[PDB]
Amino acid sequence: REIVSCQAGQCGNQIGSKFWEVISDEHGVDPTGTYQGDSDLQLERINVYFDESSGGRYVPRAVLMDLEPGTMDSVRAGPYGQLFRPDNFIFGQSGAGNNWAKGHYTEGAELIDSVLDVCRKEAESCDCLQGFQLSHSLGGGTGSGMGTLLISKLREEYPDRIMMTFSVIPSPRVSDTVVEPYNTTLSVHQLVENSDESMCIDNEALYDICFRTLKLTTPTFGDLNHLVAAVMSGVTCCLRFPGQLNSDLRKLAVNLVPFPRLHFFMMGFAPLTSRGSQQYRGLSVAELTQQMFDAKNMMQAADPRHGRYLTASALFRGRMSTKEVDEQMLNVQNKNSSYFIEWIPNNIKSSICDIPPKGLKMSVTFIGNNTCIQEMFRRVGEQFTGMFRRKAFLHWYTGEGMDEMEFTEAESNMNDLVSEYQQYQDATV
Amino acid sequence: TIAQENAKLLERLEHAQPTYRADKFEADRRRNEEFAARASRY
Amino acid sequence: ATSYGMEYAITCGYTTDYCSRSRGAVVVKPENIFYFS
Amino acid sequence: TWCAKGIFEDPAVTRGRSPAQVQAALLHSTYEVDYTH
Amino acid sequence: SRESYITGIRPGGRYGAMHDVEKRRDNLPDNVFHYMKDAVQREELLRLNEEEERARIRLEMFAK
Amino acid sequence: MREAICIHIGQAGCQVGNACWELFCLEHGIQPDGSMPSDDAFNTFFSETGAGKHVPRCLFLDLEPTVVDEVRTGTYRQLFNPEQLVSGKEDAANNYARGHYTIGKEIVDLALDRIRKLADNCTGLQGFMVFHAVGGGTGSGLGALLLERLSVDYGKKSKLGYTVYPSPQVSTAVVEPYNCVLSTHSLLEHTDVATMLDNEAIYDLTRRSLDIERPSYTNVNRLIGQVVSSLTASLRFDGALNVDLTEFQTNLVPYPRIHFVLTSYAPVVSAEKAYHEQLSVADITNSVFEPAGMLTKCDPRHGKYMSCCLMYRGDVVPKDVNAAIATIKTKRTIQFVDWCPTGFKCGINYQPPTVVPGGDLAKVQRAVCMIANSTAIAEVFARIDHKFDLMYSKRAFVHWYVGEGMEEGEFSEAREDLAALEKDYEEVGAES
Amino acid sequence: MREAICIHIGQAGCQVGNACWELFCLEHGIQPDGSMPEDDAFNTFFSETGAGKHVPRCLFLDLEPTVVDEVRTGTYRQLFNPEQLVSGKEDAANNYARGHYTIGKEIVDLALDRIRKLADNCTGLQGFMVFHAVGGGTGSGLGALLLERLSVDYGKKSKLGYTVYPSPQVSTAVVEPYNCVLSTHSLLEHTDVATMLDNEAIYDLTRRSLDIERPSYTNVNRLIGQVVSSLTASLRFDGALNVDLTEFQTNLVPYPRIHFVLTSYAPVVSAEKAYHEQLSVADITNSVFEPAGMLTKCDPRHGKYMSCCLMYRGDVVPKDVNAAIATIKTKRTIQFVDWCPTGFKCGINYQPPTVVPGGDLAKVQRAVCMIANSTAIAEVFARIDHKFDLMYSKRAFVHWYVGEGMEEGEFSEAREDLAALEKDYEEVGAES
Amino acid sequence: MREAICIHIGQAGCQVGNACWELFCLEHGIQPDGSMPSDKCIGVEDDAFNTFFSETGAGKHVPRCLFLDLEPTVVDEVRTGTYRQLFNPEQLVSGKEDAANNYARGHYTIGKEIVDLALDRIRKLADNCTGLQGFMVFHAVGGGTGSGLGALLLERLSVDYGKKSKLGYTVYPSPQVSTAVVEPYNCVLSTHSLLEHTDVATMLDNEAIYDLTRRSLDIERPSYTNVNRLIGQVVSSLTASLRFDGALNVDLTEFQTNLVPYPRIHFVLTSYAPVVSAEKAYHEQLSVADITNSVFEPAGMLTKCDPRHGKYMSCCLMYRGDVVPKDVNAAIATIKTKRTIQFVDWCPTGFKCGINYQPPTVVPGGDLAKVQRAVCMIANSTAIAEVFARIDHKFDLMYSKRAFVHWYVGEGMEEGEFSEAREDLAALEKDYEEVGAES
Ligand SMILES: Nc1nc2c(ncn2[C@@H]2O[C@H](COP(=O)(O)OP(=O)(O)OP(=O)(O)O)[C@@H](O)[C@H]2O)c(=O)[nH]1
Numbered sequence A: 001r002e003i004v005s006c007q008a009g010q011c012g013n014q015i016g017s018k019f020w021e022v023i024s025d026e027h028g029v030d031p032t033g034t035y036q037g038d039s040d041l042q043l044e045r046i047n048v049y050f051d052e053s054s055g056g057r058y059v060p061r062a063v064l065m066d067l068e069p070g071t072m073d074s075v076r077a078g079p080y081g082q083l084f085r086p087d088n089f090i091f092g093q094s095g096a097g098n099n100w101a102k103g104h105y106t107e108g109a110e111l112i113d114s115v116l117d118v119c120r121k122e123a124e125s126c127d128c129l130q131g132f133q134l135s136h137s138l139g140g141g142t143g144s145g146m147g148t149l150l151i152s153k154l155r156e157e158y159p160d161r162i163m164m165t166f167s168v169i170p171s172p173r174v175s176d177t178v179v180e181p182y183n184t185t186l187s188v189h190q191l192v193e194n195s196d197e198s199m200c201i202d203n204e205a206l207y208d209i210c211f212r213t214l215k216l217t218t219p220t221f222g223d224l225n226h227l228v229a230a231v232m233s234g235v236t237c238c239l240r241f242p243g244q245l246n247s248d249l250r251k252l253a254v255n256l257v258p259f260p261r262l263h264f265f266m267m268g269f270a271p272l273t274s275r276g277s278q279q280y281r282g283l284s285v286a287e288l289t290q291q292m293f294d295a296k297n298m299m300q301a302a303d304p305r306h307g308r309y310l311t312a313s314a315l316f317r318g319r320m321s322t323k324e325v326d327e328q329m330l331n332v333q334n335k336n337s338s339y340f341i342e343w344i345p346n347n348i349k350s351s352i353c354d355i356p357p358k359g360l361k362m363s364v365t366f367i368g369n370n371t372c373i374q375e376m377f378r379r380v381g382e383q384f385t386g387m388f389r390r391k392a393f394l395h396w397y398t399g400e401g402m403d404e405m406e407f408t409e410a411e412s413n414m415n416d417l418v419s420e421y422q423q424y425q426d427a428t429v
Numbered sequence B: 001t002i003a004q005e006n007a008k009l010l011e012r013l014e015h016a017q018p019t020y021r022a023d024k025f026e027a028d029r030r031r032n033e034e035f036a037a038r039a040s041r042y
Numbered sequence C: 001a002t003s004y005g006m007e008y009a010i011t012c013g014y015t016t017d018y019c020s021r022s023r024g025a026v027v028v029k030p031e032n033i034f035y036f037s
Numbered sequence D: 001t002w003c004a005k006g007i008f009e010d011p012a013v014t015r016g017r018s019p020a021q022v023q024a025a026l027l028h029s030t031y032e033v034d035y036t037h
Numbered sequence E: 001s002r003e004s005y006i007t008g009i010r011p012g013g014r015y016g017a018m019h020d021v022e023k024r025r026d027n028l029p030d031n032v033f034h035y036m037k038d039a040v041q042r043e044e045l046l047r048l049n050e051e052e053e054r055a056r057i058r059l060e061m062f063a064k
Numbered sequence F: 001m002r003e004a005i006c007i008h009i010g011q012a013g014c015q016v017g018n019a020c021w022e023l024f025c026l027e028h029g030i031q032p033d034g035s036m037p038s039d040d041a042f043n044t045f046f047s048e049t050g051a052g053k054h055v056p057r058c059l060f061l062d063l064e065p066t067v068v069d070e071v072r073t074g075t076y077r078q079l080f081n082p083e084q085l086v087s088g089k090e091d092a093a094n095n096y097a098r099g100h101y102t103i104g105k106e107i108v109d110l111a112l113d114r115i116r117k118l119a120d121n122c123t124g125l126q127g128f129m130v131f132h133a134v135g136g137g138t139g140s141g142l143g144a145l146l147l148e149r150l151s152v153d154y155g156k157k158s159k160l161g162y163t164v165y166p167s168p169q170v171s172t173a174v175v176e177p178y179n180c181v182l183s184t185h186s187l188l189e190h191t192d193v194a195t196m197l198d199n200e201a202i203y204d205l206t207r208r209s210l211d212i213e214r215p216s217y218t219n220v221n222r223l224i225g226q227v228v229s230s231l232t233a234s235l236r237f238d239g240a241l242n243v244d245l246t247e248f249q250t251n252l253v254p255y256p257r258i259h260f261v262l263t264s265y266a267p268v269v270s271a272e273k274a275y276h277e278q279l280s281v282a283d284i285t286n287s288v289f290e291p292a293g294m295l296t297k298c299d300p301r302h303g304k305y306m307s308c309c310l311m312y313r314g315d316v317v318p319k320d321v322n323a324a325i326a327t328i329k330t331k332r333t334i335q336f337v338d339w340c341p342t343g344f345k346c347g348i349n350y351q352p353p354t355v356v357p358g359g360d361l362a363k364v365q366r367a368v369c370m371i372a373n374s375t376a377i378a379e380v381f382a383r384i385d386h387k388f389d390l391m392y393s394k395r396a397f398v399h400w401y402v403g404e405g406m407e408e409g410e411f412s413e414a415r416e417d418l419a420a421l422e423k424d425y426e427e428v429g430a431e432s
Numbered sequence G: 001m002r003e004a005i006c007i008h009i010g011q012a013g014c015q016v017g018n019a020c021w022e023l024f025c026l027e028h029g030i031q032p033d034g035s036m037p038e039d040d041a042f043n044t045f046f047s048e049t050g051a052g053k054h055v056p057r058c059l060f061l062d063l064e065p066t067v068v069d070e071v072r073t074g075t076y077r078q079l080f081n082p083e084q085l086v087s088g089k090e091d092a093a094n095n096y097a098r099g100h101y102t103i104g105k106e107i108v109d110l111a112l113d114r115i116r117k118l119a120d121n122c123t124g125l126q127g128f129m130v131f132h133a134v135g136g137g138t139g140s141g142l143g144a145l146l147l148e149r150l151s152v153d154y155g156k157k158s159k160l161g162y163t164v165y166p167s168p169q170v171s172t173a174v175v176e177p178y179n180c181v182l183s184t185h186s187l188l189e190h191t192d193v194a195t196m197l198d199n200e201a202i203y204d205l206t207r208r209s210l211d212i213e214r215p216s217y218t219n220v221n222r223l224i225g226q227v228v229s230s231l232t233a234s235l236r237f238d239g240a241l242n243v244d245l246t247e248f249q250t251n252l253v254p255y256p257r258i259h260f261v262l263t264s265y266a267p268v269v270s271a272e273k274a275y276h277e278q279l280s281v282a283d284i285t286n287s288v289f290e291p292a293g294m295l296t297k298c299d300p301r302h303g304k305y306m307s308c309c310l311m312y313r314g315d316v317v318p319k320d321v322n323a324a325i326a327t328i329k330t331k332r333t334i335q336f337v338d339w340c341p342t343g344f345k346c347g348i349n350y351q352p353p354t355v356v357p358g359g360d361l362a363k364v365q366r367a368v369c370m371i372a373n374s375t376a377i378a379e380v381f382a383r384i385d386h387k388f389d390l391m392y393s394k395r396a397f398v399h400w401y402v403g404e405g406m407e408e409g410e411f412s413e414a415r416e417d418l419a420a421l422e423k424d425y426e427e428v429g430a431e432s
Numbered sequence H: 001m002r003e004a005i006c007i008h009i010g011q012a013g014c015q016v017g018n019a020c021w022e023l024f025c026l027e028h029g030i031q032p033d034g035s036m037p038s039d040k041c042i043g044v045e046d047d048a049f050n051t052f053f054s055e056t057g058a059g060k061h062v063p064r065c066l067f068l069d070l071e072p073t074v075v076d077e078v079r080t081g082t083y084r085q086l087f088n089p090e091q092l093v094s095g096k097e098d099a100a101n102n103y104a105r106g107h108y109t110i111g112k113e114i115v116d117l118a119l120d121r122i123r124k125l126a127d128n129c130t131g132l133q134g135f136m137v138f139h140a141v142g143g144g145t146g147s148g149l150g151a152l153l154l155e156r157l158s159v160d161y162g163k164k165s166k167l168g169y170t171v172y173p174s175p176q177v178s179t180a181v182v183e184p185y186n187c188v189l190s191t192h193s194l195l196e197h198t199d200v201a202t203m204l205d206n207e208a209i210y211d212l213t214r215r216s217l218d219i220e221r222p223s224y225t226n227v228n229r230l231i232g233q234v235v236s237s238l239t240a241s242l243r244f245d246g247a248l249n250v251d252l253t254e255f256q257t258n259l260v261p262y263p264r265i266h267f268v269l270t271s272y273a274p275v276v277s278a279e280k281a282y283h284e285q286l287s288v289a290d291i292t293n294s295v296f297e298p299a300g301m302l303t304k305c306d307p308r309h310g311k312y313m314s315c316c317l318m319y320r321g322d323v324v325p326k327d328v329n330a331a332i333a334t335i336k337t338k339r340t341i342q343f344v345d346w347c348p349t350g351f352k353c354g355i356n357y358q359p360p361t362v363v364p365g366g367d368l369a370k371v372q373r374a375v376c377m378i379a380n381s382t383a384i385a386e387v388f389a390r391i392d393h394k395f396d397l398m399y400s401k402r403a404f405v406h407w408y409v410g411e412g413m414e415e416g417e418f419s420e421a422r423e424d425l426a427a428l429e430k431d432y433e434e435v436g437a438e439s
């Protein structure tokens, strides 16, 4: 039932702060933690993401990780910074410096004991926790190294529980550092072997959505984090609110994972409308379905038309009618049969939740195990090979205890991950 | 290997036999007619 | 069941919520009490 | 730091004659609305 | 055909009748004899209780 | 006497049974508080109390707590017993293995405790009626486990499963064919009647025959509850022809392996078209027999009917019932199998159907529900096993099942007995 | 007539007596001031004084002043006599030797003086109900000394010791196995019937049958008081079968050293579940015989019942009493010893239980309390003396006992007495 | 009368025999010294232990067992164990150097210097036993000693004692959990002897016992000790019919003729139920029908061989306790009604049952629990072709370019023996396929 969350790095910390803003907004929780909602449904399942104190204040089941102390101070300065428990902030003195080795072997290892202690405390406080959640950016040092190391340790300590990760994959268009290929290659091979579902964020697609879907002149990281936080809150809405066809995270995982290696998912939201065209658009199930499968609505930069959908899941929120929702994906299955694999008859898992996000009459989050993630992984691997072929930016990693062999092994596991999707893309019955 | 036990499974499904023959039923009906003829003086 | 519909039945016996040994033959409730009118 | 407003908010719910009332109507459940006495 | 002892159906119900298992003992060991004696006595108790509940339900339904 | 115990397994089962129970309370004049403001007819579904309070003879049981807790917080909190309302902590997660080997084992013990308490409270238990969906996890695994335990405990006592099979196209889950093919074990071995209630047929019926723009699972469950009330009214209320569960059990099931039975109900009409149509018995019987009113997505014309049982409610006359039977026999498109000449069971009840306030069904003075076993039902098993074979040809989603205490050979034996089902369906449908 | 004396020794005894007396005053309609707002029905527990009010026939004997001062300053301060409310100055310090050989002797004289006053105030005394905890120090030591004095002084009067034995897993004390072993030495000789009221059995019963998250000593004492009230109701009020303390002690004790007996009570339900269940006599008897509805964790399947005494209260009738008896004999999982064919003692009273305002039990039209001697009791004694051996191997915590005027050999003597107790439990359990 | 000679070979055989004997002595009330102190429930001078124990003038009961290992660790552990007084100073042969996973070493170089003494001891036991039913060999084909010396010993016994019954209880390699790299070599080379000079060869792989202990016993960390405890339970269950009274009495030659339809088809499948622990003993209604269903279920099988994947040819049950002929017949009828357990077409009967009134004896410190009734399967089925299809595929994959062959060649072993082993294993596959084929 309960879900405990972890935020890694500056990216993960900002995204998690936005996510907790969204969750408190949905559940009627003030920045001081007091409950201001006017319904029984908001308070019925607040224990999934929150824990009550002696004074009645609701504290999130969240932990924060960053080797730079300034990120924690920024979280304090945030509007909902007072909501978090003060002892859940585990921070170092020297930053990772965008070094996976520093965040995974030298600075992350010497600090990971405290974060594991805090997650163990939260896990014991949970009556029966559904799983673990993590938000991180694989292109950084802290979000990649410490994030992967914590995924590994939590997998070892809790083998039955389910791991969810939100990994902000970098893109050459938004390549704001130089060691994105190194960090991503060195982290994907922990993500594949230690995360039950690992869904991807690309700032390129986030900016594309902000451009030609949101039509905002100058969004910011705040708007990007809100866009990812909305779907992050919607993927777990079934636990917190009832529905005509309720589901949960384990149902989503079992329906979206046909084979163990294929747990890297799509990610999308609807209805996303511009500030002007918002009043004129009639929000319906048909509009939601039309926006879900649109390429421009995906928040990772890879064309879904190129690949085939192994499977997909639609978390519809709002009081709806069920044959409409079922038929709006049946007809998509029928008219896009070339975009869906043949050996799976039903490639869509529809889940219905009664409560939509407040401020909307209707909503949906889309999570799909598409076969075009191999394009993004291929691009990352090509960049990694280009850098690694000539010892470029390698001494920084090697001097921190890492071995030259581990880079080759990470590239090899990337190749396995790519080849699986490659050979299921063109598979024939 | 998965093709190997897929072929084995297909063979076992082909060899699968229902509970009702309708030929055992016919044989039992022949026996039933024999018993009725043994009885039923008329 | 009477000709005038469902109606309270009249019986003869002591009604006691407190099943005391001594008060077996003593009326202790207004239920057994009747008044002329 | 500035964040845009109204991105994640529908006008019919947020702004209108009875925004609190429409929010309260939304925040009920399907069993509650369909199954009443 | 002749399958009654596996089908579990005889006239008079699934339960049998009382008899002296001491007489039916013939070179059987103590464990088997004890199992048989317990089975017979307990069978008799089941039969009495089934008849009692059947009669009680008859009476109740007549009273209704 | 003649009581029947209701079991509601999974989310679908709980919601269907909850609609059934609001309909039962409305029909018997029982408020959500559980009392009659102002006749032993409710006894078969409600147990009396010394304070004059009525408690349903039901067991809601789901491995996840959302639906049951929300029912607890709902209108019928004072109606439903605090126990017999079991909630789990983690669902079966749409997994037969999780529902039957990992999570169902820690809850079936208290499930049987509740069922035993209900049976002890009962006096004339006619049988069990189990509502669940074979495509989910809890409705598959926990349902199979509970059916196994009930079969080994209560013996030959009747168990009717009003189950929601996958529909040919309108399906929610992806491993739902796995769940169906694996629940085939229990729904073939440890149940005597299995009535299919797939959602696509409900949807198309409420589209082309009931005329509301956006009905949903609520309307689906209301109509299913109307159907089950039609089935149980024969023992609930007096009539010209009264049939209990075992009365029609043998009349509907010709062979132990042949107990999956199609269903249909009519008139399913709205208020606008209710008062302009003379809904005669012949008209409603013809509407039921037509595939337009058929309640499960399967074409009868592709197969042959083996045995129908008709439940008429209202002012239906014994002349009208067999006049409709004669017209049906004269009709050629509704062909019965050669070896079953009569092929008909009839039960007439003097209680007209009751319409739930705020619902979609219109008040009609008479109605009829047909529960019919026919050879045409081989198609649902054929399509579900084709889907199972397509997904199982290279072991998709099988690691989830085998990582939760399940063997590879369980899928093989499910394919084996489903195969035996289509073969013996075909062989009993074959002409002499 | 039929007077009886209650002696509450120790902290547990004092708390249990507080619960029992707050139950008894409400049972008899006596206000806490001692005066109620031709009634010779309270005589067994209260005596009419020279003021027109009623004073209980109880003695709260304890070596430390906290609990007795709480009683003297509580709501029942005007009810209890200023005497017969004995207060010590320093407790036994959780030491059997300290409570039996050093401080027990300077207080047992005045305890016996109070007992003499109670007895010669009484006119038809039947026996003494002793409430204590063998796990602790005072209830073990002073209890042993006082029971020895009563046994040598008052002759063969009934001795009903309802004491709180150590629980299998969690115990308040750490020398608690020592205290239990050294107190059973005396209770085996000077207690006609001994009843166990261990804490975790009551905790589990109140958690799973009363649906309260955190009941406490108050709630367990309320349950114990309900048990004692049910046991004494046979003599308090007239019924179908009235049985006295002497009447059931010989029925329950087969051999002189076989007198430690389990206990159970039903129904124990909350207000939420009270109005939803039809608490039939068969249902309550089955709940009693079940291992979840009993106040001792001596799993009856581990042994064989020797003699079960049942106390029915309310509208219970002898025929469904014996129907419950017969179905209990018919139940598979429990068996009786082969030399107790009868094995059953029954007593029916017409007075239903009375609930306490602000309490935890809902009003029930009938109830049943069991006191049972069974061979499964040897398991708790085996655990207790196994713990005793574990502590005594290293001579841990023995200096405290030997420094309070206790010989070291008494530990060993009690150890082989417990060994003989388990051996002859096994002997009487062995089939002929 | 009805004596049987136990012969244990190798480390696995020695430990299996140790478990079997520690079970037998407690089942017959024999102390570790070798004497029965006093029994009142059991009649005195009862010739029930005569089959497994030979009486001595000092009231001693010397086991009719021979231990034979080319290396002294296990036999010296037995000599220094708690059964030193019980076991004969002889009958406990010790070597000086093991075969070391080498069939060639166990059969050609080191086996010849100890086979003479092994046959000396065997002839001593045969002279002592006047009603010898047969020899029960206990070993594992994985090890070099158990392969080579086992093959040599069985060949010598077959050529010396004629048509005496031979029960070869062999721990075959498991599909994945295996401890030896040349184990496919040893297994494929031992099939000559295990096919020619063995009357009934019993599948006793390891990982099946591992899974059975991890599921039925609900114990997470068991070992070879628990594996041996279960295997001894099975052995005693199937061999106590000739030691205790029962409704249906069966001897070794009495049931091997039922098990084995054809001379080459004698490899057999085992299961045992109800196998429960102390906690789960009272949690189930263990009746005859329930225990028979659990026996026929593949979950309770003691070897990795799915019954659903083949045709059952012969099958006999060994019931112990308060079982009754009606109960076993009802169990049989339920099995016929069940279709997941379907027999071969040409064998209609296919069933034998033996009933013994002696319930199983639980060893103290073991994970088993007392059961009022129990039953052990032993069945010859066509499904056993798959373990051979796995082991020969493994052997061919290893033998593709002559791996580990030099070790065998250097120990006086012909190179073509590997090819001959492959050929008659292929024949043992083909005759299984032919006999399972529909007529
Ligand atoms: N008729 C009807 N079917 C429903 C209803 N709700 C869900 N279903 C069916 O349930 C199927 C999906 O299964 P799940 O979502 O796993 O629900 P479940 O069968 O109870 O299984 P669990 O969720 O694991 O407990 C859908 O295909 C629907 O056909 C309902 O209200 N009425």
Ligand SMILES: Nc1nc2c(ncn2[C@@H]2O[C@H](COP(=O)(O)OP(=O)(O)OP(=O)(O)O)[C@@H](O)[C@H]2O)c(=O)[nH]1
Binding pocket: G009, G010, G011, G012, G013, G015, G016, G064, G091, G092, G093, G094, G095, G099, G133, G135, G136, G137, G138, G139, G140, G164, G166, G171, G172, G173, G197, G199, G217, G218, G220, G221, G224
């Ligand atoms: N049922 C019940 N048991 C109690 C209660 N209070 C204490 N106990 C039991 O008493 C045991 C400990 O002994 P004490 O409560 O100290 O009684 P005592 O030994 O006579 O008092 P001291 O000699 O001062 O220790 C614990 O193990 C409890 O099980 C109570 O309120 N109700």
Ligand SMILES: Nc1nc2c(ncn2[C@@H]2O[C@H](COP(=O)(O)OP(=O)(O)OP(=O)(O)O)[C@@H](O)[C@H]2O)c(=O)[nH]1
Binding pocket: H009, H010, H011, H012, H013, H015, H016, H070, H071, H098, H099, H100, H101, H139, H140, H141, H142, H143, H144, H145, H146, H147, H171, H178, H179, H180, H204, H205, H206, H224, H225, H227, H228, H231
């Ligand atoms: N069932 C069972 N199997 C065993 C036991 N001990 C060993 N085994 C297995 O049997 C296989 C072969 O046993 P052995 O013939 O004794 O081989 P070994 O132990 O190496 O000894 P050598 O044969 O002399 O080489 C080993 O690989 C073990 O995995 C046991 O006690 N019981």
Ligand SMILES: Nc1nc2c(ncn2[C@@H]2O[C@H](COP(=O)(O)OP(=O)(O)O)[C@@H](O)[C@H]2O)c(=O)[nH]1
Binding pocket: A008, A009, A010, A011, A014, A015, A096, A098, A137, A139, A140, A141, A142, A143, A144, A168, A170, A174, A175, A176, A177, A203, A221, A222, A224, A225
């Ligand atoms: N969505 C989002 N992405 C961010 C934010 N801040 C940084 N990023 C992304 O995170 C990546 C760099 O991560 P980094 O800060 O080095 O991670 P760290 O080293 O663990 O702190 C860049 O590619 C950015 O696009 C933010 O506030 N929101």
Ligand SMILES: [Mg+2]
Binding pocket: A246, A247, F010, F011, F064, F091
């Ligand atoms: Mg569910």
Ligand SMILES: [Mg+2]
Binding pocket: G010, G011, G064, G091, G138
């Ligand atoms: Mg004290």
Ligand SMILES: [Mg+2]
Binding pocket: H010, H011, H071, H098, H143, H145
């Ligand atoms: Mg060796």
